[PDB]
Amino acid sequence: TIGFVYELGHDALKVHSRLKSSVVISYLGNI
C-alpha cells in the first residue's frame, strides 16, 4: 500500500494535471 501512495503522490500514471498581476503601480505626485 505504501508503494501505491507513492504513485498516487507523484502522478506517475500522469492522469492528473490536466490571474492576479504582479505589476503594482504607486502614485507619488508632482516633482
Binding site: I2, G3, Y6, E7, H10, A12, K14, S17
Partner: protein, 54 residues
C-alpha cells in the same frame, strides 16, 4: 508407477493453493517480506527513471 488410497491422510484434503497459504503467511513469512520489498523497489525505481516529475 503404482498408487493406492489412504484414509487418515484424506480427512480434510486441501487444494495446492490452500496448502501454499497454510505456510506462505506464517512459517516462511520472511520470504513474503523480501518479495514485498522487491516489488516495492520495482515500483519506486521504475517510476523514478522514466517519468518527468510534475
Amino acid at each position: 508407477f503404482i498408487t493406492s488410497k489412504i484414509w487418515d491422510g484424506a480427512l480434510a484434503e486441501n487444494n495446492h493453493i490452500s496448502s501454499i497459504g497454510n505456510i506462505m503467511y506464517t512459517n516462511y513469512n520472511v520470504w513474503l517480506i523480501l518479495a514485498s520489498f522487491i516489488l516495492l523497489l520495482a515500483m519506486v525505481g521504475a517510476i523514478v527513471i522514466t517519468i518527468k516529475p510534475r
